[PDB]
């Protein structure tokens, strides 16, 4: 019996639970009668006694070895609750105060390791990534609930200033791709701003998206993020925050509408000199209606909550009363500047008049979704009737009428459930499809 | 691994001046075919 | 294509799995999960998404079977390395994809019994994995997704950690990766995303950009590329062109009409094996009675150097995957259909080829065809003799005497 729980032909086995041996030794060199563990201690003529050593001694040897990663992994393995040799390793038996007294020299030596590498021009992308990932994960499992032990965020800020005079070229890169793979969120605002500035004088424009896409909304930092986005005019990122954090979708739509109808003075979300392209409203609605988060592909986080959002957007888009300012209000905005003409579906009319081709493409994409399926409520018949009545009344220069007729013909081409149309109604479409002087669409008209 | 071995060569000198042995709290005893048990302290101190 | 001539110079034999009789269905379960042959007498199969079995096709009797991995480990691909490890890979919808490696001649019976683990960790868990490539010496592995993301893993995989998950290239406009081929083992990579075929360098010093832009005007569809290992070439397919891109980048363009591709594969650095699917042809003159059944795939084997068509036959149902390996000097190919057949394609004897070609009456072509393999002089003299008499019997004598000039000593 080596100890109270450890028990020892050419291996100390713990009696508790399994009887697996500890390790192996070669006593033949020491001239091993065979039978000839006293007080936790032990060739041909001389007397040799073997004794255990300290973990700190092993760490010191690893320092002399020139590599700290071995000692890093050794300490991490020792940090596990299963330490049958804790008493033999001059450590406290219970794991709680064992981890309490440890993991401080872990932090100090991890800090010293980066300085050791940067001293001998260790600019290789390999070693730094491995060491940083190991440190990050190890600090991640150990939930720091006690005194001292600065969080992982503080460690990154400390390590940032170590690289200086062009040495910050790849350290930001090594900090990145951990957000991409995903093992930590809630980074320090200062380092966030530094990384944003570093990639600002560069044309990445894509690593930033993921940098915000994965990172949890628990760390808000909205004001700083909003200011950075406004300075960099990053409208796709701007809309996402309002979609998720501010929990408002009508406000971006109203801002885009104001940007459209010569009313940029009333915009709130977008106020910088740069103006987003008008096509955003022709893709954001597509994403929301079918179910999607702009600009990514994931439909929705909450299942049932999406129904309210889609019903709200569908009611607002195809309204016919020119609803008032979002939320409770006493006055109503207008599509046009002077409010005298009767607004019979003004928003839909404006959207159709702004761009025929993109609007038709968006509608064609929307019909293939399950939103119009019955499963107020808007069906395909309502939209087809709206377009059919919008066909006449000479309100178009015949540049949009032909496209509308083509789209109606294509929509009524397929009908197991779509729509039944009166015979006289088809006469207008048939006449319009081949009575216009517009050119460049001869090939499309034939197949349609 | 962490088993550092410390060796004292004074055993041969003491024998000149190895069947079984047993260590005490501070010293050790050795017995062989000589028939005289040898007591040796850890500080090179000697029936 | 009918522009060139048709030959018959590869021995093709189809066989049916005999275990299909009764309930011992070796090939009836949907097993789109990939397989791979090791030597001309062995075969591996995956089934039920976590069972691996080995079968000796010489007698169609199961030798050993095992099941590993937790649930939802849907096996995607399966292939053998230049050595013998036979890596295995799969994915889960929520759980991050885990890749592990086994060893040949060491069959597992317990649960894990692995040798190494790979921990590909993309953002969340979506966008299932696409074509992958692994180094011959187990040094670097390149993985491509179906959104525009390319990832690389380096270091030692056999014994050390498969770390260094550095991401290279982002591919804006959200285009899926269609082909990732590792070049000569030292340092090169070929990429494609249905446009802008790229010449990536695995040094890792790229600034998130195409290392060497090339033909950034078009691309190709899924699993439509090949790679000759002998001369480090990039045999691929285009709308009406075939390319021979090298390490530095050359262009040996050809001319051919091919507008219905689905899969291509090279064989022996001189013949390329393709599979063709057409499913009829629509036109105004003819009338489509109903949903016509898909005409089964027609297989062509194009040949380099001289322009000729090797074989053209029909298969039973479809093609799942192709193995196409052989340790001997000759090389053989293998196909797996829907129900499962073992079409064997082997090179025929040279004497049979010369006999059929002289039956075809194209003797002058047979001259250099025999010259390619450097036949014995006696065979050359015999060929000259038969050509000379076959010319003489027609009625022309001058060229017959010209052939007889070196037809002597026989």
Asked whether A1 and A37 are in contact (CB, 8 A), the reply is yes
Q: Are A51 and B6 in contact (CB under 8 A)?
A: yes
Q: Which helix or strand (DSSP H or E) is residue C22 part of?
A: none
Q: What is the dihedral of CA C60, C65, C70, C76, to 10 degrees?
A: -30
Could you tell me if residue A314 is left (phi over 0), alpha (psi between -120 and 50 degrees) or otherwise beta? Answer: alpha
The span from the CA of C182 to the CA of C141, in Å, is 9
Return the closest-CA partner of residue C339 out of C17, C48, C14, C44. Answer: C17
Cβ atoms < 10 Å from Cβ of C154 = 19
Tokens of A418: 């779509």
Quote the tokens at residue A433.
């499809």
Per 3-state DSSP, chain B is made up of helix, strand and coil in percentages (nearest 5) of: 15, 40, 45
Instruction: Answer whether C308's CB lies under 8 Å from C292's CB.
Output: no
Rg (CA), chain C: 25
The Cα of A416 is separated from the nearest Cα of chain C by a number of Å equal to: 19
Listed in sequence order, the residues at least 6 apart from C266 whose beta carbon sits closer than 8 Å to its beta carbon are C226, C227, C228, C235, C272, C273
- The Cα A170–Cα A126 span in angstroms is 11
**CB distance from A49 to chain C under 8 Å?**
no
- Torsion angle, CA of A245/A246/A247/A251, rounded to 10 degrees? -140
Contact call for A and B: 3+ CB–CB distances under 8 Å? yes
Buried b (16+ CB within 10 A) or exposed e, C52-73: bbebebeeeeeeeebebbeeeb
**Whole-angstrom distance, CA of residue C300 vs CA of residue C312:** 5
Distance from C-alpha of C340 to C-alpha of A395, rounded to nearest angstrom: 64
- Residue identified by tokens 């006694």 is A49
Helix (H) or strand (E) holding C12: strand C10-13
Which of C56, B43, B4 minimizes the C-alpha distance to A54?
B4
Count CB neighbours of A392 within 10 A: 11
Minimal Cβ distance to A130: which of C122, C163, C204? C163
Residues 6+ apart with CB under 8 A from A370: none
Strand partners, C270: none
DSSP string, C70-139: -SS-EEEEE---SSS---EEEE-SSSPP-EEE--TT----SS---SEEE----SSS-S----EEE-TTS-
Cis bond upstream, residue A295 (ω within 30): yes
DSSP C168-220: ----TTT----EEEE-SSSS-EEEESSS--B---TTS---SS-SSB--TT---
Return the residue matching tokens 């363009």. C253
Residue C278: burial class (beta carbons within 10 Å; 0-12, 13-18, 19+):
exposed
CA distance linking residue B35 with residue A86, whole number of Å: 42
Distance CA(C118)–CA(C129), nearest Å, equals 14
The answer to whether the Cβ–Cβ distance between C165 and A177 falls below 8 Å is yes
Mutation to test the C interface, candidates A173, A181, A185, most C Cβ within 10 Å: A181
For chain B, what is the radius of gyration of the CA atoms? Answer: 12
Q: How far is CA A44 from CA A29, B8, B45, in A?
A: 10, 12, 21
Q: Which residues pair with A49 in a beta bridge?
A: B6
HSE-CB at C150 with a 13 A cutoff on CA atoms is: 27
Measured in residues, chain C has a length of: 410
Helix or strand holding residue C303 (H, E): strand C298-303
Total number of residues shown for chain A? 448
Structure token digits, residue C138: 């187990």
The three-state DSSP-derived secondary structure of chain A is CCCCCCECCCCCECCCCCCCECCCCCCCCCCCCCCCCECCECCCCCEEEEECCCHHHHHHHHHHHCCCHHHHHHHHHHCCCCCCCCCCCCCCCCHHHHHHHCCHHHHHHHHHHHHHHHHCCCCCHHHHHHHHHHHHHHHHHCCCCCCCCCCHHHHHHHHHCCCCCCCHHHHHHHHCCHHHHCCCCCCCHHHHHHHHHHHHCCCCCCHHHHHHHCCCCCCCCHHHHHHHHHHHCCHHHHHHHHHHCCCCCHHHHHHHHHHHCCCHHHCCCCCCCCCCCHHHHHHHHHHHHHCCCCCCCCCCCCCCHHHHHHHHHHHHHCCCCCCCCCCCCCCCCCCCCCCCCCCCCHHHHHHHHHCHHHHHHHHHHHHCCCCCCCCCCCCHHHHHHHHHHHHCCCCCCCCCHHHHHHHHHHHHHCCCCCCCCCHHHHHHHHHHHCCCCCCCCHHHHHHC
DSSP structure class, residue C335: B
Q: Could you report how far apart the first and last alpha carbons of chain A are, in Å?
A: 91
Write down which chains contact chain B via at least 3 CB pairs under 8 A.
A
Half-sphere exposure of C312 (CA within 13 A, CB side): 12
For residues C209 and C196, give the distance between their C-alpha atoms in angstroms, rounded to a whole number: 12
Distance CA A312, CA C253 (A): 57
Q: Do A47 and B11 touch (CB under 8 A)?
A: yes
Residue A36: which of B3, B9, B21 has the nearest Cβ?
B21
Residues whose CB is less than 8 angstroms from the CB of residue A368 and which lie 6 or more positions away in sequence, other chains included: none
Pick from A338, A342, A302, A337: which is nearest to A322 by CA?
A: A342
Local structure of residue C281 (DSSP, 8 states): -
Spatial CA neighbour of C116 closest among C79, C155, C72, C143:
C155
Measured at the CA of A186, the angle between CA A185 and CA A189, to 5 degrees, comes to 135
Nearest residue to C407 (alpha-carbon basis) of C391, C369, C351, C359: C391
Question: C164–A182: do the CB atoms touch at under 8 Å?
Answer: no
Q: Other C-beta atoms within 10 Å of A396: how many?
A: 17
- Number of alpha helices (DSSP H) and beta strands (DSSP E) in chain B: 1, 4
Chain A residues close to C208, C-beta within 8 Å: 204
Which of helix, strand or coil describes residue C403? helix
d(CA A280, CA A302) in angstroms, rounded, equals: 24
Residues A272/A259, Cβ–Cβ less than 8 Å: no
Closest Cα to residue A285, out of A353, A228, A358?
A: A358
Please give, rounded to a whole number of angstroms, the shortest distance from the CA of A425 to a CA of chain C.
30
Burial A96-129, CB ≥16 within 10 A → b, else e? eebbeebbeebeebbeebbeebbeeeeeeeeebb
The helix (H) or strand (E) run that includes residue C263 is strand C261-266
Determine contact, residues A177/C165, Cβ cutoff 8 Å: yes
| CA gap A324, A167 in Å, rounded | 56
Any bridge partners for residue C90, and if so which? C75
- Token pair belonging to A46: 């001389």
| Contact by Cβ (8 Å): C403, C386 | no
Q: Do C163 and A182 touch (CB under 8 A)?
A: no
Residue with tokens 């940067």: A118
Query: What are the CA-CA distances from residue A209 to residues A187, A191, C121, C127, C248 (Å)?
Result: 15, 16, 18, 17, 35
Closest chain A residue to B25, measured at CA: A39
d(CA A428, CA A304): 42
Show the CA angle centred on residue C5, arms to residues C3 and C10, nearest 5°: 135
Question: Is any Cβ of chain B less than 8 angstroms from the Cβ of A39?
Answer: yes
**CB contact at 8 A, C226 and C235:** yes
Phi, then psi, of C107 in degrees rounded to 5 = -75, 140
> Do residue C164 and residue A214 have CB atoms under 8 angstroms apart?
no
Q: Does A180 touch chain C (CB under 8 A)?
A: yes
Find the length of chain B. 47
Question: CA–CA separation, A73 vs A110, rounded Å?
Answer: 12
Distance CA C28, CA C39 (A): 24
Report the C-alpha gap between C157 and A43 in whole angstroms.
43
User: Residue ranges of the alpha helices (H) in chain B?
Assistant: 10-16
CA-based end-to-end distance of chain C: 42
Query: How far is Cα C87 from Cα C102, in angstroms, rounded to an integer?
Result: 6
What tokens appear for A270 in the block? Answer: 């977008």
In contact, C206 and C214? CB cutoff 8 Å:
no
A54 to chain B: nearest residue by CA? B2
CB contact under 8 A, A50 and B21: no
């Amino acid at each position: 019996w080596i100890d109270q729980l450890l028990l020892g032909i050419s291996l100390v086995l713990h009696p508790q639970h399994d009887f697996k041996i500890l390790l192996r030794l070669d006593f033949l060199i020491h001239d091993l009668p065979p039978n000839k563990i006293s007080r936790r201690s032990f060739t041909n003529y001389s007397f040799k006694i073997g004794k255990f050593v300290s973990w700190s001694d092993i760490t010191l040897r690893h320092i002399l070895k020139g590599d700290y990663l071995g000692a890093l992994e050794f300490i991490e393995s020792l940090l596990q609750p299963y330490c049958p040799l804790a008493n033999l390793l001059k450590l406290d038996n219970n794991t709680e105060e064992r981890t309490k007294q440890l993991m401080e020299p872990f932090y100090n030596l991890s800090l010293a390791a980066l300085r050791f590498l940067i001293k001998k021009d260790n600019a290789d992308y390999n070693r730094v990534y491995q060491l940083l990932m190991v440190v990050v994960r190890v600090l991640q499992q150990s939930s720091k609930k006690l005194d001292s032990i600065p969080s992982l965020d503080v460690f990154l800020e400390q390590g940032l200033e170590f690289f200086e005079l062009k040495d910050n070229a790849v350290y930001f890169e090594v900090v990145a791709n951990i957000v991409a793979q995903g093992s930590v969120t809630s980074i320090s605002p200062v380092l966030f701003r530094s990384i944003i500035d570093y990639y600002a004088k560069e044309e990445n424009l894509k690593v930033i998206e993921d940098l915000i896409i994965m990172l949890n909304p628990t760390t808000l930092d909205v004001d700083l993020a909003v200011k950075l986005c406004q300075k960099y005019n990053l409208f796709d990122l701007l809309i996402y925050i309002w979609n998720k954090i501010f929990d408002d979708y009508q406000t971006p739509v109203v801002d885009l509408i104001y940007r459209i109808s010569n009313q940029s003075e009333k915009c709130v979300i977008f106020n910088g000199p740069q103006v987003p392209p008008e096509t955003t409203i022709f893709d954001y609605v597509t994403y929301i209606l079918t179910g999607r988060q702009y600009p990514q592909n994931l439909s929705i986080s909450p299942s049932d909550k999406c129904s309210k959002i889609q019903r709200e957007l569908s009611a607002f888009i195809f309204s016919g009363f020119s609803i008032k300012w979002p939320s409770n209000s006493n006055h109503k905005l207008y599509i046009c500047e002077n409010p005298e003409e009767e607004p019979a579906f003004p928003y839909f009319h404006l959207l159709l008049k702004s761009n025929p081709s993109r609007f038709l493409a968006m509608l064609n994409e929307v019909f293939e979704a399950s939103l119009f399926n019955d499963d107020e409520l808007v069906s395909r018949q309502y939209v087809i009737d709206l377009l059919l009545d919008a066909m006449k009344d000479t309100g178009n220069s015949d540049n949009i009428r032909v496209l509308v007729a083509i789209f109606i013909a294509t929509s009524i081409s397929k009908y197991p459930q779509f729509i039944k149309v009166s015979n006289q109604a088809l006469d207008c479409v048939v006449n319009t499809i081949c009575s216009s002087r517009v050119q460049g669409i001869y090939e499309i008209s034939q197949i349609a | 691994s962490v088993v550092s071995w410390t060796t004292l060569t004074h055993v041969y000198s003491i024998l000149g001046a190895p069947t079984c042995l047993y260590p005490t709290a501070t010293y050790f005893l050795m017995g062989t075919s000589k028939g005289c048990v040898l007591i040796f302290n850890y500080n090179e101190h000697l029936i | 294509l009918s522009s060139w001539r048709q030959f018959q110079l590869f021995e093709n034999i189809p066989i049916r799995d005999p275990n299909f009789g009764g309930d011992s269905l070796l090939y009836s379960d949907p097993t789109l999960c990939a397989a791979t042959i090791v030597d001309p007498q062995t075969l591996i199969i995956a089934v039920n998404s976590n069972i691996i079995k080995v079968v000796k096709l010489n007698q169609s009797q199961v030798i050993h079977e095992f099941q590993s991995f937790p649930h939802d480990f849907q096996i995607t691909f399966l292939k053998v390395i230049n050595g013998e490890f036979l890596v295995a890979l799969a994915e889960s919808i929520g759980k991050p994809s885990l890749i592990r490696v086994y060893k040949l001649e060491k069959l597992p019976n317990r649960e894990q019994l692995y040798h190494s683990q790979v921990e590909l960790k993309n953002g969340n868990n979506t966008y299932p994995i696409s074509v992958v490539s692994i180094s011959n010496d187990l040094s670097c592995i390149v993985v491509g997704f179906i959104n525009g993301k390319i990832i690389l893993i380096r270091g030692d995989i056999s014994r050390d950690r498969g770390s260094q998950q550095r991401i290279i290239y982002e591919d804006p406009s959200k285009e899926p990766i269609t082909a990732l081929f590792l070049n000569n083992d030292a340092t090169a990579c070929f990429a494609a995303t249905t446009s802008r075929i790229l010449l990536f360098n695995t040094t890792g010093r790229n600034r998130g950009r195409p290392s060497l832009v090339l033909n950034s005007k078009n691309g190709l569809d899924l699993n439509c590329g090949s790679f000759n290992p002998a001369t480090n070439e990039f045999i691929c397919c285009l709308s009406n062109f075939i390319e021979f891109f090298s390490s530095s980048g050359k262009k040996h363009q050809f001319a051919f009409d091919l507008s219905l591709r689905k899969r291509i594969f090279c064989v022996d650095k001189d013949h390329i094996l393709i599979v063709t699917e057409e499913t009829g042809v629509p036109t105004t003159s003819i009338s489509v009675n109903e949903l016509s059944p898909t005409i089964i795939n027609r297989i062509f084997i194009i040949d380099a150097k001289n322009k000729i068509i090797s074989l053209n036959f029909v298969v039973s149902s479809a093609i799942i995957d192709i193995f196409s390996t052989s340790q001997s000097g000759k090389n053989i190919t293998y196909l797996l259909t829907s129900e499962g057949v073992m079409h064997r394609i082997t090179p025929k004897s040279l004497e049979n080829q010369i006999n059929i070609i002289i039956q075809k009456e194209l003797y002058p072509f047979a001259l250099q065809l025999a010259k390619q393999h450097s036949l014995s002089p006696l065979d050359v003299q015999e060929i000259h003799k038969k050509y000379g008499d076959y010319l003489f019997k027609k009625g022309l004598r001058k060229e017959a005497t010209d052939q007889y000039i070196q037809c002597l000593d026989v």
